Amino acid sequence: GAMATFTANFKDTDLKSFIETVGANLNKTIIMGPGVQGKVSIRTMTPLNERQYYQLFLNLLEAQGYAVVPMENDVLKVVKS
Amino acid sequence: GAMATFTANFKDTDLKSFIETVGANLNKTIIMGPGVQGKVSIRTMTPLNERQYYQLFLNLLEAQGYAVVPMENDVLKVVKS
Which residues are in coiled coils (chains A, B)? Predict the structure, then answer.
């Protein structure tokens, strides 16, 4: 039932900037290790609700070789796996 | 990369006018119940995505005593809570 308003359409986008954008869109504080580097592409087929967008982000980062762990006070920390 | 593009800058405007303006920005037709009245000022601090913007709207209205009910054909209904 939740509103489906989240989309992604990135081609060869800087991965750090992508992570920052997603974090902002999810109202999370982002902590990134210095190993977080490179490019990512992702295009949603249809709009997502917030939880589905969060799930996509997790599944994508895992596939990219990045570990993503929640920390106190609304933090997501992303580091090399 | 361009979800977070909603903004608000309203000073001493009619609540009804504010509701209508949000509706237009969300491409939603507004249905208002009786006794929706007031004045509001509100300013976003950074640009918001649709979920964030809608939630800001809901939070503001709830503080005034109003609920929002999505309805069919891209309607938002605003009634006393």
Answer: none
